[PDB]
Design a protein around this ligand. Sequence first.
Ligand code: SF4
Length: 212
Amino acid sequence: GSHMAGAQDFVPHTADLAELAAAAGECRGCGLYRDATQAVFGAGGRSARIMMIGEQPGDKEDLAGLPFVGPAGRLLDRALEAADIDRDALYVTNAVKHFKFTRAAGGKRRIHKTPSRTEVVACRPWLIAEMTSVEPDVVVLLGATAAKALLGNDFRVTQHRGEVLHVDDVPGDPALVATVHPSSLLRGPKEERESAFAGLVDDLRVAADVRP
DNA sequence: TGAGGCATGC
Ligand code: SF4
C-alpha cells in the first residue's frame, strides 16, 4: 500500500481457521500490532452459514482475544436472540484485527480509536481469507467500517441498511446485508435506543431469511 | 463508557 505494507503477504495459503488465526498473531501489515495486546481473529466454524463482520476489537476484545465480548457484544447477543439466530450458525469477526486506541497523557484508560481506511485496506486480506474458508450464504456488515470494507468507501449504511446486496468483487458471491454497529445503539440517545435495537433486529432477520 | 457521516487541520 501507499502508507501501510498490508497484510497480504502475511496470510498463509490455507482455509484452516486455526492456522489463519495463528498467522494473524504474527502480522505486521500495519502499525496496529505494536500497541495491541494480541490479534483478535474471528470466532466460529467453517460450517457457519452467516458471517458477521464488525469494525475492530474494543478494550474487552483486546484483553480476551475474542470478538464481541464487551458492551456492544452483549447488545448483539440480545439481538441475535430476538431474531432466533443460533450462534452455531455464526462466524463472527472484525474488519481490523488489532485494537487501535490512544491514551490521554495524564490518563490510564485506553480510548477506542476508529481504524483508518488505510488500516482497513491493510487488514482486508484476512477478511478475504476468512470469507473464502467459511463460504457463508450471507454476510452481515455491522457498521460503516465493515460495510465500506466490502462495498466501497461511498457506501452508506444509513442509506442502504437492511437491503440484500451482491457485489462481484467478493469471493463466493454471498448475499450482503448492512446494518448499524451495535455500539451505535449505546453511543446514541437513550430514548432512541429501543427503536434502534428493533431496527438492528429487523436487519438481522433479513439476513437470516436469505435462501441460497 | 460503549457510532455515523459530514466537516476542518497540517
Ligand atoms: S490490524 Fe490487521 S493488518 Fe494491521 S497488523 Fe493487525 S492483523 Fe495485520
